Structures are given as structure tokens and as C-alpha cells.
């Protein structure tokens, strides 16, 4: 019933990530908080 | 690829604006519920260490408003970590270490069997000392909050020397636990 991800698993997923940010997320960030957006 | 998270989380952002009230500066930036979307979000926004003085980030479970008056927070409290000893880049680096380690511990459900009692995390970026806090649901559960505090200190490598305070939200309107 419990879904867990330890530190190494999460960091490895970041280090090997290649997929881009979903466009819906990017547009939402731009809409409500453009000033914190990094790209 | 898809690694679903136990919980769906909302990131909130408090934009420093000296002319406006708290409620008018706060924005729900994005919800996410996978490891992929967690990192997409974190990768494309300013780190805690890159925010202007006076800004906040909040990460709370979907449905929990990032305010102590929320039914999910009202009977609860927070573990508080103050980042004020180091200077300039070293302080900034420690702040970012604490925030991201905390976020990873939360979304990865690393707080043993007590994840149901986690509400969210808050970072306040302040010139006088940044604050990183872990909010829990029930301030009467010493067993829960003590264990959560121990994991918190372990994950963030907070030394036994530095004593963390668990403060009850209600009393803020003297720590219940020190660690």
C-alpha cells in the first residue's frame, strides 16, 4: 500500500532524466509565477 | 517513464511584495504526482537559495491549504530548522541542501510509517535567517512527531548539537518537543 522512493532512486531519476517539462506545467508556471521560471 | 508518488503534492509560491498582504502574494504554482513531474518542476523554478528575501515556497498535499488554520493543520504543528549561523554562499548552500533533502524525503515517503501525518513543508527566505519547517497533522501524537523529527535530522544531516523545536500551531496564536 506504500509507494516509497529513497534518495538514491530519486537522484538517479533526476540525473538520467531526458524528457522535457510537460507544456501544461510550463504554461501554468508562466501564468501564475513567471518570475521564478528557469529555462 | 512513470514513477507515481504515494501522494499528489501542490507547490505554492509566496512572492515578496511589500505593498500586499500574505493572502494576496500566494500562488499555487503546480500540482504533481510523479517523480518525473517532481523533477520537471523543481528543475524549472528558482531554488530556495535563488529567491528574493521575503519569499516562501510551500509544498503541501493536494487539498491542504498552506496555513495553520486549515482543518488538516489546525491541531498540528511544525518541526523548525533555522539557517542563520553560516554566511553568504555557505548559508545559501545549506539552505538549498535542507530544502531539497526535505522535499525528497517527503515525496519519497521516507518518514517510516507516519506519512499520513505529514502535511507539508515550508521554506521562508529571510535576510535574518532562513527557516525550513516540516508540518504535521496532530500535535498530540508525540510518538509520531518524535520519529518524524529524528528522520528529519537524519535526512538533513542536522547535528545532534543543533536542537530542533516542534511548535504547536495553536500556541502561536515554548516548544512541545526539542530534539
From Swiss-Prot, chain A:
Top-level taxon of origin: Eukaryota
Q: Where in the cell is it found?
A: Cytoplasm
Q: How does it assemble?
A: Interacts with eukaryotic translation initiation factor ife-3.
Job of this protein: Plays a role in promoting translation.
What UniProt notes about the protein's domains is: Binds to ife-3 using a bipartite interface in the C-terminal domain which comprises a canonical helix which engages the ife-3 dorsal surface and a non-canonical helix which engages the ife-3 lateral surface.
Protein name listed in UniProt: Eukaryotic translation initiation factor 4E-binding protein Mextli homolog
- Report the portion of the entire protein shown: 471 to 507 of 507
UniProtKB/Swiss-Prot annotation, chain B:
Q: Which domain of life is it from?
A: Eukaryota
Keywords of the record, alphabetical order, are: Cytoplasm, Initiation factor, Protein biosynthesis, RNA-binding, RNA-mediated gene silencing, Translation regulation
Cell compartments where the protein resides: Cytoplasmic granule; Cytoplasm, Perinuclear region
This entry carries the following GO cellular component terms, namely:
eukaryotic translation initiation factor 4F complex; perinuclear region of cytoplasm; RNA cap binding complex; translation initiation complex
Purpose: Recognizes and binds the 7-methylguanosine-containing mRNA cap during an early step in the initiation of protein synthesis and facilitates ribosome binding by inducing the unwinding of the mRNAs secondary structures. All 5 eIF4E proteins bind monomethyl cap structures. Only ife-1, ife-2 and ife-5 bind trimethyl cap structures which result from trans-splicing. Translation of trimethyl cap structure mRNAs may be regulated by intracellular redox state; disulfide bonds change the width and depth of the cap-binding cavity determining selectivity to mRNA caps. Ife-3 is essential for viability.
Membership in a protein family: Belongs to the eukaryotic initiation factor 4E family.
Q: What does the subunit section of this Swiss-Prot or TrEMBL entry state?
A: eIF4F is a multi-subunit complex, the composition of which varies with external and internal environmental conditions. It is composed of at least eIF4A, eIF4E and eIF4G. eIF4E is also known to interact with other partners. Interacts with mxt. Component of the pid-1 variant of the PETISCO complex (also called the pid-3, erh-2, tofu-6, and ife-3 small RNA complex) containing at least pid-1, tofu-6, ife-3, pid-3, and erh-2, which is required for the biogenesis of a class of 21 nucleotide PIWI-interacting RNAs (piRNAs) that possess a uracil residue at the 5'-end (also called 21U-RNAs).
The name this protein carries in UniProt is Eukaryotic translation initiation factor 4E-3
Starting at the broadest rank, the lineage of the source organism is: Eukaryota, Metazoa, Ecdysozoa, Nematoda, Chromadorea
